[PDB]
Subunit: 359 residues, 4 copies
């Protein structure tokens, strides 16, 4: 029911940056710069512009001081200047609100288009950006937990197939998904850049931003972030992990910033650039689908997510999911999951894996 426009989709390269509204800029800076080691491209009393170790565009993360913590924009780089025009025509044909600024919404971005998309998310499309020193060989700066790239976003939306169809028309290709035997979709992952995803849809009340993910080189870099958070006595901000994902096969960690924005650290997924890249569908009851080692998924992972803003900076109203809840069908009192399909040994009924119930 989101129609395919007659207008051609913009050619999207990759996820490029997020703008997050934060309430205390100094506390946020401590987290992203001092704890996580991201590199400052620009900062003032109002905003902090941050990039990963291997980035050459101006930034991967913009922290903007504001009254209500929320996602303000998730930005995708398009292939040419003309693709911004294509994005504008595309979303206008969808009847979405758009705003076009020839000199950008944030520093280091040129001609850019922001839109309130059909799922209620603030997307940005841009080509022009200020190139900065690519720090990829600055091993004099390299931290034991170095974040090397922006990898993806993850969005919470009530109707996954509706959103997926819309993203496929935009050019994103589905790589993996989670479904049940009676036709409910719980989550889908989709890419432009040849990794498992650039964005992903997680079934839930929405629009909300589930997380932004950065990559490391190696698994030990993710271990170090955990170790460093323990040393800083902020282990309570480690939400979930570390682990190996089923979907994507990446090694992962989820942590929470000072405003509870969720950040994933992620490494070593696989190549998806071929157009007949085999899709993988997982059963929602498979306890190795999210954590391959069977570790239980914390309920906050399923329930909590950041607000998103519309183009005036007001919070988007949330619409409730009516399809089945992943939490409820897997780890709730009526849930279940299995280690081996069909085997009662290693299956969990009315609780999570490993001997825990919901707190």
């Amino acid at each position: 029911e989101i129609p395919k426009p007659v207008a051609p989709a913009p050619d999207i390269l990759r996820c490029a940056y997020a703008e997050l509204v934060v309430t205390d800029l100094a506390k946020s800076r401590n987290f992203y710069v001092d704890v996580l080691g991201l590199h400052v491209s620009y900062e003032d009393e109002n905003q902090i512009y941050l990039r990963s170790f291997e980035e050459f565009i101006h930034h991967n993360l913009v922290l903007t001081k504001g009254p209500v913590a929320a996602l303000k924009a998730m930005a995708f780089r398009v292939r040419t200047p003309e693709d911004v025009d294509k994005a504008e025509a595309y979303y206008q044909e969808l009847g979405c609100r758009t705003e076009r600024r020839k000199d950008g919404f944030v520093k280091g971005i040129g001609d850019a288009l922001r839109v309130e998309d059909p799922l209620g998310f603030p997307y940005e499309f841009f080509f022009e950006t200020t190139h900065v020193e690519r720090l990829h060989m600055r091993y004099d700066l390299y931290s034991a937990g170095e974040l090397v790239r922006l990898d993806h976003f993850n969005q919470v939306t009530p109707d996954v197939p509706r959103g997926r169809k819309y993203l496929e028309d935009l050019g994103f290709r589905v790589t993996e998904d989670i479904q049940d035997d009676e036709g409910t979709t719980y989550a889908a992952w989709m890419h432009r850049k040849g990794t498992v995803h650039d964005t992903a849809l997680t079934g839930g009340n929405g629009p909300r931003l589930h997380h932004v993910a950065f990559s490391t080189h190696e698994k030990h870099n993710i271990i170090q972030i955990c170790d460093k958070m323990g040393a800083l006595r902020i282990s309570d901000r480690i939400e979930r992990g570390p682990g190996r994902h089923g979907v994507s096969n990446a090694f992962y960690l989820y942590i929470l910033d000072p405003d509870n924005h969720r950040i994933e650290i992620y490494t070593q997924d696989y190549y998806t650039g071929d157009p007949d890249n085999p899709t993988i569908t997982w059963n929602v009851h498979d306890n190795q689908r999210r954590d391959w080692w069977g570790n239980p998924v914390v309920p906050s992972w399923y329930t909590e997510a950041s607000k998103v803003l519309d183009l005036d900076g007001n919070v988007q109203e949330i619409i409730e999911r009516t399809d089945d809840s992943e939490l409820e069908v897997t780890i709730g009192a009526d849930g279940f999951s299995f280690t081996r399909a069909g085997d009662e040994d290693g299956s969990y009924h009315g609780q999570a894996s490993k001997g825990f119930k919901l707190g």
Copy 2:
């Protein structure tokens, strides 16, 4: 309570091997050889003799077929032939039942003394052992999850201070422990070889064997064990982890063998060989003491452990712990844990960390 003998203690080098009784030898072989990659020194219809990658003594693990799965012996190597005589005299003075076999209890061990120690555990002391090819540079054999050394044992016993004093008199030095502000010791770690430990006491009903631990070279090796267990669809046999320990600072994983004997994989603890090595005491309510990252300790970790045998091969009767339960005081109904001492934020009252409760 356990008196210091007048007889000199044996000079103990290190933990050397454990003999575990298993119910199905083939299934147990599949676990230790095919899944974990231990190296077969000898086997027959009744026993499998296994060693780690860097070992030169005959074995680190003996699997013995029997009717009831149990620990049959935890074995420590002593410095000289004469230390076996010292051991016999020492335990005889302690009023303990002992058995001496000039040609060993298991193949590849010579003159050996087994004892029913004052905590009810079957200890063996030996010097003589058949040397085998040390595989430390056999990289043609090296597995992605290679177990390189035997590291320690961990024993469940109801009265930790009683056992701790006895082990200190035997020459083990306590490196770390867990206590509360009311005089209760929950656990202690003690060594001879200059690592955090060779054995350890965990407060609980006993005597029972909590685990046997093997080490890997690096953290990624432990990750690979998890990943392989996922691939073999036996993730339900991963009990707890992987993680970073608070006590010991080691990276760790706990898995369960076919008879539910617990095995820990462990790496990168610190040097303790100096006689005034600083002893570290953690508070039992510190939520970073067991898992540095704050991840909850599954209840089975506190409640489940292996039976131990007496010298006749009969199961030792279990004596109930009357001191406070670590489980109860941290994750139980009236339990409490903190992330930062004296901060309510990041504390847990009557449940586990990260959003979980006891199943």
Copy 3:
């Protein structure tokens, strides 16, 4: 001076496989399967088809028994079936010899075009391929040295600018190169898939195949290959490395198969998918350009490379490079390199 065809270029996805002729198939199998741990997709008495851990197409490497060890085909996957037609029209316009087999040249590949390209290299273009089990989560099979993807080829050719322009016309984008102040190009790296390269041109006598490269997940996997080669007492087959590259920033190792085909093991280069990806030019005298740690490049790495075959299976005649030699200008008797530009300390002259 290779003219751009008016015919549209095929849309190339990536490097996909190489077909190497080997003289002793069993010896070759020992190296690629037992030492290196590649996964068998098919074998018989004449060929072995091998793939890396994360591959879903039929193979990344075909070993074919033949009388003379050589590269028989370096194969690139194209985006659609129609791109094979585009490739045929493109190379035909270039005046190249071509051969189309609607049922493929090797097993597991369908409609395929092979060509003797303008640099004398046997290129293949195909879309159709038999999908196989993607082993990316088969950690029960995973080796301590596991090879997880095919990453790139490297080609020895006498005139780098000439080849570079030809590959740019084909849609490859240069990511890094090596030049001097006099204006000589010694090497160039170029990509389609968004890594530092899918192929690369090394200045030298050619056409010859310098190496085929596979990636690992982590640096320790490369270390393990070395360690295993020591344990197998074949450390003499370790040619160069392990190291960190300057160009590409990748951790690397070069080893030699039983017919002296050079295999690179490679990991952790960077993303190049943006069309304005900044191009990095290194000076040929910078001693950190090839090995970032300043370790010397053994002369064999510059002088040795594999023969390539024409479409009849005969060895391609070789053309001598007339441009300056990177070996000669860096480690030859009149060569030099520096650690810090302009500093005699940490410089090497004739050495």
Copy 4:
């Protein structure tokens, strides 16, 4: 030739610290703290006291400003205060010069004995030391190249068998050595703490200090040290490696400090604490003995080493080795090495491996 004293040997725990005389304290600080990330226990205008990540004794390295760069002391910790007395009586009986100071020679060490040992090296034995914060869990400080422990020293000495017998009587156990088929010993490694070594003897003109070695947790930490040195454009201070050793099986790297004092970064050797630990002897012509991957050993690694000082602070005179030279027999003009014993293929005649 060096007699075994009647007096009991001291019970030596491990190598504990080295005192290095350096010429420019600021440059040495930049290397050891800024490049390598060692932790400052104490510093003033004359000395920098440094320790590794997991250490609790006051320091593993003392950098002392002086006119001539050299080893001033290689220190071993002993098990009890009474073992310093035992050390003293032992070295007096050996006829060695000794000097004992109840309040130590450097800050952070108490009662200490220093000796000019029978091979001409300045050994210190102590028990008493000031405990400091053990940083083993301070992951807020942890560097990508973090040095976690002091592992060993390596000493250059002309007659290895002579030295080996002496260290053995002192309680060190030989774990590995290098010999040839003609009765010559080229190197030996020996331990107290249950690793491959606490010190080692390399055949060569001496006494000289070959290197001091620090451990990392993992192989990637050593790789990061190389990468950082490249980024700082000081790759010319990487001498050798990184590699896998044959002897010891450890992953390694050799780098040079501003006074050319050689530092090794080392990780993942094996447990040697059993008294019948099997000794491993390598042939000197085995090209996998030093670098398991057969990478060539640069001649500077065999020829260059640091001066050592006597108890008065003067440089020890160097005695020339007359036994065969490892450099000459493996990579010199008449040198030879093999990959596979008895196989001509993969052997090197009169030159180093790998072209």
